[PDB]
mmCIF file of C-alpha atoms (C1' of nucleotides) in Angstrom:
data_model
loop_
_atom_site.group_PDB
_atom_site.id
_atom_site.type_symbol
_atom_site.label_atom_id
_atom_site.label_comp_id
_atom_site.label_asym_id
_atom_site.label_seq_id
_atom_site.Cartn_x
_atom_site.Cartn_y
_atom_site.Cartn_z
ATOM 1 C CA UNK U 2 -14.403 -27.441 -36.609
ATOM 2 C CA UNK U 3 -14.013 -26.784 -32.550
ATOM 3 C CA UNK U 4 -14.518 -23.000 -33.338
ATOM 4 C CA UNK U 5 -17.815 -23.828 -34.168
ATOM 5 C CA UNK U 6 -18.683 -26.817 -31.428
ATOM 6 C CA UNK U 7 -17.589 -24.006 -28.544
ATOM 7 C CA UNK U 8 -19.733 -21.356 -30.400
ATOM 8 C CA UNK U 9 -23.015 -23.786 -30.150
ATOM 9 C CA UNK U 10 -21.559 -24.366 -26.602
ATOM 10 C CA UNK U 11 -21.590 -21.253 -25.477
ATOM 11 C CA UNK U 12 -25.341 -20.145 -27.029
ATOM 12 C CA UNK U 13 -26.683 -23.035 -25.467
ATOM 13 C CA UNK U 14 -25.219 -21.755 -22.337
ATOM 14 C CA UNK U 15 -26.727 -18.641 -23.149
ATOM 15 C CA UNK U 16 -30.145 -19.953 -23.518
ATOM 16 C CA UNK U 17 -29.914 -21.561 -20.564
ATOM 17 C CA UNK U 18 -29.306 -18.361 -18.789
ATOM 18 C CA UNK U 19 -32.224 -16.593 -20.322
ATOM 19 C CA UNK U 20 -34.287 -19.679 -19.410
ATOM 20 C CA UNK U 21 -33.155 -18.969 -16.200
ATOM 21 C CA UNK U 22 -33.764 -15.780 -15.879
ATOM 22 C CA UNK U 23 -37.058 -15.777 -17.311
ATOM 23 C CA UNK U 24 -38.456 -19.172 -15.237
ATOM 24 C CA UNK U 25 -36.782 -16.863 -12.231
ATOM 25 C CA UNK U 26 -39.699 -14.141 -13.079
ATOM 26 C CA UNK U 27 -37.373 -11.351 -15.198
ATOM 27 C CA UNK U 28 -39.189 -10.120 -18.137
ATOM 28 C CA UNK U 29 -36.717 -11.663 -21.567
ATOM 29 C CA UNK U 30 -37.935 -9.519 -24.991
ATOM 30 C CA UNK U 31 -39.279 -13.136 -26.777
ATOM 31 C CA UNK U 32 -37.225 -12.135 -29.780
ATOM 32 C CA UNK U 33 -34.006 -12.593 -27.893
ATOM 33 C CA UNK U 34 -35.412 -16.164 -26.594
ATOM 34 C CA UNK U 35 -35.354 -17.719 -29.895
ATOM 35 C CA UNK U 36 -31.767 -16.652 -30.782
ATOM 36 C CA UNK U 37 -30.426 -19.229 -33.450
ATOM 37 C CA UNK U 38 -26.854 -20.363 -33.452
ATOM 38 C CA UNK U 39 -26.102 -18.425 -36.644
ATOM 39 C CA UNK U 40 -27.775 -15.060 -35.535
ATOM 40 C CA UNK U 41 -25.953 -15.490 -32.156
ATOM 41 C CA UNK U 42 -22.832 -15.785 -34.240
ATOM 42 C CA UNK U 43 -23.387 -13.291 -36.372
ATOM 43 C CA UNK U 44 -23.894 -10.734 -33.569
ATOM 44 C CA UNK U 45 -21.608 -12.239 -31.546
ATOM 45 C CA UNK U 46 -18.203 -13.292 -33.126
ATOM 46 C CA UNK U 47 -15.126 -11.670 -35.081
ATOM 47 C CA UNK U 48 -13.547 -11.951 -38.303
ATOM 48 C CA UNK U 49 -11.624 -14.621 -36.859
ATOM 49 C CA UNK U 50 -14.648 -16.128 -35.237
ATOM 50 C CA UNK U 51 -13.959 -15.689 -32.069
ATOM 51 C CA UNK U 52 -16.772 -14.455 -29.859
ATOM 52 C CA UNK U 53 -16.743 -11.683 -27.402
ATOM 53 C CA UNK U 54 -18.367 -12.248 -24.262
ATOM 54 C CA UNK U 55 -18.582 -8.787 -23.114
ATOM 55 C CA UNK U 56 -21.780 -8.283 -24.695
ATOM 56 C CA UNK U 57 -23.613 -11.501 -24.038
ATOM 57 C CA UNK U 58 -23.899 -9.531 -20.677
ATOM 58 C CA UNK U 59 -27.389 -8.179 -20.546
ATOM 59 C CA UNK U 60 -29.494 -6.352 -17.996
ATOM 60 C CA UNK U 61 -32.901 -8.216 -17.290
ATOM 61 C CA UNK U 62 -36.220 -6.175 -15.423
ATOM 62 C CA UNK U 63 -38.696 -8.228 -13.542
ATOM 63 C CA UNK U 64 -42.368 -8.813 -15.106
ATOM 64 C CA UNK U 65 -45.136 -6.970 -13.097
ATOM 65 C CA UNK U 66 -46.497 -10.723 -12.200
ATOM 66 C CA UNK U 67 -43.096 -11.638 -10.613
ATOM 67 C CA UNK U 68 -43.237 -8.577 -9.094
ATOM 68 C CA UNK U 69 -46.966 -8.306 -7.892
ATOM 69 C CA UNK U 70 -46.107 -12.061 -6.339
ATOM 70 C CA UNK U 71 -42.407 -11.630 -5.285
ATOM 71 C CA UNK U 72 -42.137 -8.244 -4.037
ATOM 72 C CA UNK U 73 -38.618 -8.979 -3.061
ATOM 73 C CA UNK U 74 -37.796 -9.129 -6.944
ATOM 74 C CA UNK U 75 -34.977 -6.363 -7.996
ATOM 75 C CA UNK U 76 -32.821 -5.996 -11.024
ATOM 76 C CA UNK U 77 -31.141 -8.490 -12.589
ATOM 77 C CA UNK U 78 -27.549 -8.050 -13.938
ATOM 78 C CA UNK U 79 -26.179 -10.878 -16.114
ATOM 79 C CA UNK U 80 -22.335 -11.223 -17.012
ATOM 80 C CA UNK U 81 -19.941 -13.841 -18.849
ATOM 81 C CA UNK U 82 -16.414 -12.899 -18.123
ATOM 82 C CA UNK U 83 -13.862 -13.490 -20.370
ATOM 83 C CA UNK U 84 -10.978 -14.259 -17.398
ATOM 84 C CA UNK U 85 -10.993 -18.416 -17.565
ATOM 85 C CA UNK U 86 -9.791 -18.180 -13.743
ATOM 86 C CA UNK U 87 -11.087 -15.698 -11.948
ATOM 87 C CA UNK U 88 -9.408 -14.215 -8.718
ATOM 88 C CA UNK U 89 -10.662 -11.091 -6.116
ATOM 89 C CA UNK U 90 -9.662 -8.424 -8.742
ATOM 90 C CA UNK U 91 -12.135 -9.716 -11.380
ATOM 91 C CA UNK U 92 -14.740 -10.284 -8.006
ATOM 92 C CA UNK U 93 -13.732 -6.642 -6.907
ATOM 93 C CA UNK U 94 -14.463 -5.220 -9.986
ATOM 94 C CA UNK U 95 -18.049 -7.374 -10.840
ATOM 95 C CA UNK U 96 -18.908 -6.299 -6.647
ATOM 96 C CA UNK U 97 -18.438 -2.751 -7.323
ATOM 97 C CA UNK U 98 -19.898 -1.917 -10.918
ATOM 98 C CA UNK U 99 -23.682 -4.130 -9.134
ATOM 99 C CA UNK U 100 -23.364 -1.616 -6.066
ATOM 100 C CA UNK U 101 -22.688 0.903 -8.109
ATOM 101 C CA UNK U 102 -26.054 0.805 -10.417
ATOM 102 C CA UNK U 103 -27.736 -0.607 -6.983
ATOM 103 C CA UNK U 104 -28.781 -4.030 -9.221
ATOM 104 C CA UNK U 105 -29.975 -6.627 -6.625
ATOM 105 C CA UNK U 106 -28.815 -10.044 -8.159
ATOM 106 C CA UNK U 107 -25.508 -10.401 -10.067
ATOM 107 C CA UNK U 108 -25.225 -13.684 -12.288
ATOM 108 C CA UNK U 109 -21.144 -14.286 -12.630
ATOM 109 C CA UNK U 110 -20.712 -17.003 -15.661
ATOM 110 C CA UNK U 111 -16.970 -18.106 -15.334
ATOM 111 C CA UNK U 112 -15.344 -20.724 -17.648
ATOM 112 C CA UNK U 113 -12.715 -22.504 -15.588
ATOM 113 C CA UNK U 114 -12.751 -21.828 -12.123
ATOM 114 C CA UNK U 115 -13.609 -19.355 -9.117
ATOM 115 C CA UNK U 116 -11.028 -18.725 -6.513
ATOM 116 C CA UNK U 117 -11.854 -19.090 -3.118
ATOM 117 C CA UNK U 118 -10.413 -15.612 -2.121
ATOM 118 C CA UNK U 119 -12.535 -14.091 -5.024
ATOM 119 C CA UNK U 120 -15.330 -16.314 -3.275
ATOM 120 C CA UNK U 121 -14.918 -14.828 -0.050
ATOM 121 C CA UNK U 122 -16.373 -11.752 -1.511
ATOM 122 C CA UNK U 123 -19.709 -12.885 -2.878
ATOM 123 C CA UNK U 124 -21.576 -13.389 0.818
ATOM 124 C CA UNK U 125 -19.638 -9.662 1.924
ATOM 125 C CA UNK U 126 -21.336 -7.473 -0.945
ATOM 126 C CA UNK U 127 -24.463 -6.674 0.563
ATOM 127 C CA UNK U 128 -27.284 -5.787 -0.008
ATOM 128 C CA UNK U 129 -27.257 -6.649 -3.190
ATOM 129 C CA UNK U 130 -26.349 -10.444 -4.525
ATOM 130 C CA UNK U 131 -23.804 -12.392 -6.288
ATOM 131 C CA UNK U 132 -24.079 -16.047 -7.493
ATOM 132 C CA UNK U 133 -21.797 -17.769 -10.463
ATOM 133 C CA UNK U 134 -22.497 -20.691 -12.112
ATOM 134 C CA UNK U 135 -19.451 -22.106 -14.584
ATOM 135 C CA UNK U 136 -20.374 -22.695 -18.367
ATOM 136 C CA UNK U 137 -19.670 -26.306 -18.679
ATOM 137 C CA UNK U 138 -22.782 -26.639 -15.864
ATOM 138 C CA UNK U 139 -25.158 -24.306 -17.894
ATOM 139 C CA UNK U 140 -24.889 -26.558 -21.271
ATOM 140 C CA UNK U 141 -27.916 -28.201 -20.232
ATOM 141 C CA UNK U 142 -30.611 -26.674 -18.512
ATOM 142 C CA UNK U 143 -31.343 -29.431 -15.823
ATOM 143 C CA UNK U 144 -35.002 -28.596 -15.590
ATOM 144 C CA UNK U 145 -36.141 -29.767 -18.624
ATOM 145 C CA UNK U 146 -34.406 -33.366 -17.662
ATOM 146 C CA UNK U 147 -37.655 -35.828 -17.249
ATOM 147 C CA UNK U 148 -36.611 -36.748 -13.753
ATOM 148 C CA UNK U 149 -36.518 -32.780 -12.969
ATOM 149 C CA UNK U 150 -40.291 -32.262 -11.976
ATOM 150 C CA UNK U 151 -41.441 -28.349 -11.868
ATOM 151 C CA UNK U 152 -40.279 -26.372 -9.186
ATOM 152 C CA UNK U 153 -42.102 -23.253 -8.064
ATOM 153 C CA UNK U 154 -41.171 -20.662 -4.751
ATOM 154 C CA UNK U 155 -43.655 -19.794 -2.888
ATOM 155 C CA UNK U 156 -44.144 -16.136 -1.583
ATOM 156 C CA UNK U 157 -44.403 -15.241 1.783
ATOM 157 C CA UNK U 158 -47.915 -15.138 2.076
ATOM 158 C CA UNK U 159 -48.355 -18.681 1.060
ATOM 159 C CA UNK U 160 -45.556 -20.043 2.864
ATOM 160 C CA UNK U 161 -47.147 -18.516 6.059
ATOM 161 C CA UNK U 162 -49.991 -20.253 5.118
ATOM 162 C CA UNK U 163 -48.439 -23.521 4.633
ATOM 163 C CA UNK U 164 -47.044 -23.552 8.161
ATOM 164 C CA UNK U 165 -49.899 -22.644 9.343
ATOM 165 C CA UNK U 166 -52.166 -25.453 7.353
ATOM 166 C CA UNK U 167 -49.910 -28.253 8.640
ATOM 167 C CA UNK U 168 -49.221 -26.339 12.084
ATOM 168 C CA UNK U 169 -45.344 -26.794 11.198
ATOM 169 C CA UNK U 170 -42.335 -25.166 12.167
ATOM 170 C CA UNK U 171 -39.688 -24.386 9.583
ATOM 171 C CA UNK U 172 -37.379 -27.004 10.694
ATOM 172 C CA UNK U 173 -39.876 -29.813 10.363
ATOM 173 C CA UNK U 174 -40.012 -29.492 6.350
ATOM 174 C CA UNK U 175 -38.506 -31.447 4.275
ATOM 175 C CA UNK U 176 -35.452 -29.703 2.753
ATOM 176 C CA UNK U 177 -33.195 -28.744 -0.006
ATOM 177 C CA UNK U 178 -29.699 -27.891 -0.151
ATOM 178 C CA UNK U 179 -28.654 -24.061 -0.747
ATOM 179 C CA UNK U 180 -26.330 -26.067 -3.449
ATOM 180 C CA UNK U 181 -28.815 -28.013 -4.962
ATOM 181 C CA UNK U 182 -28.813 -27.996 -8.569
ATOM 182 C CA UNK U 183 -32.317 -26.778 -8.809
ATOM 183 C CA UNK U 184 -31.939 -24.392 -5.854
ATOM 184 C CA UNK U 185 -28.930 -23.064 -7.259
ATOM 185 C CA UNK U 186 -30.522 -22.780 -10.775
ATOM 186 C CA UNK U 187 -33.603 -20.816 -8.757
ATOM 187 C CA UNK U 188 -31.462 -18.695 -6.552
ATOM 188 C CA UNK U 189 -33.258 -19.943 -3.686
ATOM 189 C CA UNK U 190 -32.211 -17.948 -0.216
ATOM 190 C CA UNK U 191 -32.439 -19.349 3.569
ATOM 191 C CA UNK U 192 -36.317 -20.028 4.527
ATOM 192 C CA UNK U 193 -37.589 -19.689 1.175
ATOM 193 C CA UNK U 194 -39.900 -22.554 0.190
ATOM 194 C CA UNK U 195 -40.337 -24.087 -3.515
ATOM 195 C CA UNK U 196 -43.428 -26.534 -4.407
ATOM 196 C CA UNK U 197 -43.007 -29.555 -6.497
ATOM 197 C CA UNK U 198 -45.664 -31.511 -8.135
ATOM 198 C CA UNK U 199 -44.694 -34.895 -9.362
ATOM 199 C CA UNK U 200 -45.983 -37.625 -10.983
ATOM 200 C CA UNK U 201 -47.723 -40.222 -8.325
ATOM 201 C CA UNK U 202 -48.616 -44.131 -9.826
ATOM 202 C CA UNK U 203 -50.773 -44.368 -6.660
ATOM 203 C CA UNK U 204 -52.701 -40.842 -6.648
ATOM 204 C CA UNK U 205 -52.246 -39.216 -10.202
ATOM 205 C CA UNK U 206 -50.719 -36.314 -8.674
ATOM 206 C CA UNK U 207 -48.800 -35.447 -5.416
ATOM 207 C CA UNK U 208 -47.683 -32.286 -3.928
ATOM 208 C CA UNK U 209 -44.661 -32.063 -1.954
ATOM 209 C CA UNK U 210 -42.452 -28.532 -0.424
ATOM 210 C CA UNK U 211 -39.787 -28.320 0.616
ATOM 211 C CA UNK U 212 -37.756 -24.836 3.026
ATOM 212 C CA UNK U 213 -34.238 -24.219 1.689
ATOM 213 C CA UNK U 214 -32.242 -25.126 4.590
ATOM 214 C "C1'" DC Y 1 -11.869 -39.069 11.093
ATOM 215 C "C1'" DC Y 2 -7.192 -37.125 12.458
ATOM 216 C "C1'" DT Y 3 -2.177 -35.698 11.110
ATOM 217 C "C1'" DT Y 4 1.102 -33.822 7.905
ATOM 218 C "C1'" DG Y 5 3.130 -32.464 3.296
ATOM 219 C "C1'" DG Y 6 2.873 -30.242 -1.356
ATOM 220 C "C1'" DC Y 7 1.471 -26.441 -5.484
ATOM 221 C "C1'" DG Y 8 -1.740 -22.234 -6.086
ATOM 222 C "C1'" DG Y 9 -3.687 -17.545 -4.653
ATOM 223 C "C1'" DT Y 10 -2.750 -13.093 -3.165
ATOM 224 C "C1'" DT Y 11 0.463 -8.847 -1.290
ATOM 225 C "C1'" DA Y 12 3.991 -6.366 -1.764
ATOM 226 C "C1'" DA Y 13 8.282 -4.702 -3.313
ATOM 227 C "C1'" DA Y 14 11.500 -4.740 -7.292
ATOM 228 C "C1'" DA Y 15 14.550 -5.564 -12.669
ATOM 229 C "C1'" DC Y 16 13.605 -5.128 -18.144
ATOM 230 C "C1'" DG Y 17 12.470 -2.509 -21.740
ATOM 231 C "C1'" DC Y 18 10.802 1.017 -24.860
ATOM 232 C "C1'" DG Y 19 10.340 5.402 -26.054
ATOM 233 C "C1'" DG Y 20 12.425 9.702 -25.082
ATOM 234 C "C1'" DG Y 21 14.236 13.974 -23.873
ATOM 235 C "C1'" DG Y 22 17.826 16.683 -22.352
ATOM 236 C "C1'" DG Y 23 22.724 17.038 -20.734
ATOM 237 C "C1'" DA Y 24 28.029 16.168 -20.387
ATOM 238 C "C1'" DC Y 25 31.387 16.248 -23.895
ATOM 239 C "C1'" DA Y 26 34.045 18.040 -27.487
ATOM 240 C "C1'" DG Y 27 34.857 21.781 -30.532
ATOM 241 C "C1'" DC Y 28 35.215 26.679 -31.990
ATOM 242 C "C1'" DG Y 29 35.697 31.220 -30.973
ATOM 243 C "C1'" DC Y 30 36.590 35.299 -27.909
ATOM 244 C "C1'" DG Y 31 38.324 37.736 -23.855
ATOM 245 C "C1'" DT Y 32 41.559 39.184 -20.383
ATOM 246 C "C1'" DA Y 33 44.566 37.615 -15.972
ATOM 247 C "C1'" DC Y 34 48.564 36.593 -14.692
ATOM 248 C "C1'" DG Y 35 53.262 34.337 -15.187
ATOM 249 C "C1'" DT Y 36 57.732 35.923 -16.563
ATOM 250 C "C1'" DG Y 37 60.444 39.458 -16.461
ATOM 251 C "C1'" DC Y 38 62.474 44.250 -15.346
ATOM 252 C "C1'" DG Y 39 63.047 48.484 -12.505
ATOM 253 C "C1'" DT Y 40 62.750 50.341 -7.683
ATOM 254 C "C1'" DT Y 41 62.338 49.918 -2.681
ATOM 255 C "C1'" DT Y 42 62.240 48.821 2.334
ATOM 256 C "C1'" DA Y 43 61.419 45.943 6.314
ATOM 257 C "C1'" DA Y 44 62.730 41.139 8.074
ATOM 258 C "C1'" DG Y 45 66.948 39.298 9.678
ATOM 259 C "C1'" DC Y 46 71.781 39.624 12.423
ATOM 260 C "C1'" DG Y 47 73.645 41.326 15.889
ATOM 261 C "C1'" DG Y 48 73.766 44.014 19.896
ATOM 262 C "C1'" DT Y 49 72.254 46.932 24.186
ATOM 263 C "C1'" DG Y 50 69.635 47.579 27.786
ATOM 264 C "C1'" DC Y 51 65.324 47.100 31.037
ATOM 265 C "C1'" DT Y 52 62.202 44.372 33.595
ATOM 266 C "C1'" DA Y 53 57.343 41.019 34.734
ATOM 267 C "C1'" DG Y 54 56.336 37.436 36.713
ATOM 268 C "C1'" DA Y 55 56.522 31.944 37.011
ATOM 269 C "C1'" DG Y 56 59.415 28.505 39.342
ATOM 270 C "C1'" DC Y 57 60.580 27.772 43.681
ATOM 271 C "C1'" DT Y 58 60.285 27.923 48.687
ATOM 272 C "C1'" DG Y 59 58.024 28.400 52.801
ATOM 273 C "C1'" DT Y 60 53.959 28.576 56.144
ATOM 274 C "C1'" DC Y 61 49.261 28.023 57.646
ATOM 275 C "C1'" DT Y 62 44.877 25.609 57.164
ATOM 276 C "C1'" DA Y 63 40.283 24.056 56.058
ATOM 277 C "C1'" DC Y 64 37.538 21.582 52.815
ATOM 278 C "C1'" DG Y 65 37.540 16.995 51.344
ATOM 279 C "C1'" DA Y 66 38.163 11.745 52.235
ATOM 280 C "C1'" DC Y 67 36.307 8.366 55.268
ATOM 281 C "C1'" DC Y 68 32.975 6.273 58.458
ATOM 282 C "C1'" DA Y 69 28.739 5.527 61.018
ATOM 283 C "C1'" DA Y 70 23.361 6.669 61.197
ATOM 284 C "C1'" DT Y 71 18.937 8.276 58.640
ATOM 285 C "C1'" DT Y 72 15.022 8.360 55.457
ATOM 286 C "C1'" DG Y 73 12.075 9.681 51.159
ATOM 287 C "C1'" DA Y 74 12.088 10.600 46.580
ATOM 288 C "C1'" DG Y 75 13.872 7.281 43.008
ATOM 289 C "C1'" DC Y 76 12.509 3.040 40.881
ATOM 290 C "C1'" DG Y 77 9.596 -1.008 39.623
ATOM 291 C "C1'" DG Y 78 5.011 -2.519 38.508
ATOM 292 C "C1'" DC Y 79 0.309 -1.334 37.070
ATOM 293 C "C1'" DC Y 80 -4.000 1.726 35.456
ATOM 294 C "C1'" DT Y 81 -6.314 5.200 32.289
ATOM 295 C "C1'" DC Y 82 -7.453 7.926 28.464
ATOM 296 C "C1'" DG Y 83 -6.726 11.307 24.372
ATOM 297 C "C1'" DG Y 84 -3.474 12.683 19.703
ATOM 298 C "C1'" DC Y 85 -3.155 11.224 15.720
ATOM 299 C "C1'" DA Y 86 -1.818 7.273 11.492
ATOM 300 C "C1'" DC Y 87 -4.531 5.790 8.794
ATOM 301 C "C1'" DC Y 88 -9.012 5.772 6.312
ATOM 302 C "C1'" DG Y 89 -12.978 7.830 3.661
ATOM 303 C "C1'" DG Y 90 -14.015 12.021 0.780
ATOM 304 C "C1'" DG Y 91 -13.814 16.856 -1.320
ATOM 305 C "C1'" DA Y 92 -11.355 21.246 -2.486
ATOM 306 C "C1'" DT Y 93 -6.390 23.120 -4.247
ATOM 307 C "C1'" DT Y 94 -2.863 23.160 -7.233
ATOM 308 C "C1'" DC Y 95 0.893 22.105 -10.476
ATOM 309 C "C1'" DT Y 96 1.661 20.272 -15.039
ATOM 310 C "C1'" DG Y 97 1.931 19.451 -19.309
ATOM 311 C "C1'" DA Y 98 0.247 19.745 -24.258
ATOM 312 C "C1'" DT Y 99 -2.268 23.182 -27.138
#
DNA sequence: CCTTGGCGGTTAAAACGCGGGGGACAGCGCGTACGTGCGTTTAAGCGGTGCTAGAGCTGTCTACGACCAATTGAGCGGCCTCGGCACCGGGATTCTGAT
């Protein structure tokens, strides 16, 4: 019954997040890609079927290509809480266990809602990085939609030499929200630029970039 | 877009409760201190007898204090500056209890 529709729920969340992760240039063992709905269950839930979301929480490493292109790319820490709200003890807590193994980008999965006390904290925990995305939004991973076309961050050494190609400043690209569903699903930062190649009914194929705010 | 009124979120201080451990209470038993009494004694009390030191009273002289002009500088009000420590971050000491 509903046990089982939030199970499949929550491993499709899951996927998503190793999706993610892996599009985002962390190395994922391809083993724990294909994770089926019954061997997520199995590994996951009780006797009373119940699943425990403490150790959904992985650690992810990035793949020497992600890291021979983004040399910015640190350790990646991954966690579904099991608090439906979550308030600045929970964000407290998640702050000081990344600082404390130095991990440079903390995913925080919530269920119901984030606090905005407990999201004061997530711009004041440098250096490293916090950004939460709520289950109901991971369901579906958005880049697969047909409308979605590929997108692709440049590294600094190409986005110098896109300025430079076009003889642009940084303000005269076109843009993207820090929010933006794709942005957000990237972890996109300030200045960072992403390529997008999209269908074109007039050229075959078109290139377009745009600077993240 | 501007103005104002709810239900949450977080801080901070405080009853309920559950185990729990020890302490006032009551009882029992033992010890000896003192009330009650008896035998013996002398110093407080009554009543005199006498001796005397000094405070109340009076008197006399007076000088420091009350009162009233003049005088002036430290006391008082308003600012200006800077270091001891309450609190914070972090490590070494030390009870403290179960074993």
């Amino acid at each position: 019954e509903d046990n089982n529709r939030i199970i499949s729920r929550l491993w499709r969340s899951f996927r998503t997040v190793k999706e993610m992760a892996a599009d985002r240039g962390y190395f994922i063992s391809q083993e724990e890609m294909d994770q089926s709905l019954e061997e997520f269950r199995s590994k996951i839930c009780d006797s009373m079927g119940n699943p425990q979301r403490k150790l959904m929480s992985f650690l992810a490493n990035p793949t020497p290509e992600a890291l021979e292109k983004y040399s910015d790319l640190g350790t990646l820490w991954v966690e579904f809480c099991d608090e439906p709200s979550v308030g600045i003890k929970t964000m407290r807590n998640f702050c000081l266990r990344i600082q404390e193994k130095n991990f440079s980008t903390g995913i925080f999965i919530y269920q119901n809602n984030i606090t905005p006390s407990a999201n004061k904290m997530i711009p004041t925990v440098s250096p490293a990085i916090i950004e939460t995305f709520q289950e109901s939004d991971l369901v579906v991973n958005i880049t697969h939609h047909e409308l979605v076309p590929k997108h692709i961050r440049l590294s600094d050494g190409e986005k110098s030499q896109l300025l430079q190609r076009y003889k642009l400043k940084e303000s005269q690209l076109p843009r993207i929200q820090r929010e933006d569903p794709v942005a957000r699903y990237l972890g996109l930062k300030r200045g960072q630029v992403v390529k997008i190649i999209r269908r074109s009914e007039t050229s075959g194929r078109y290139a377009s970039y745009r600077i993240c705010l």
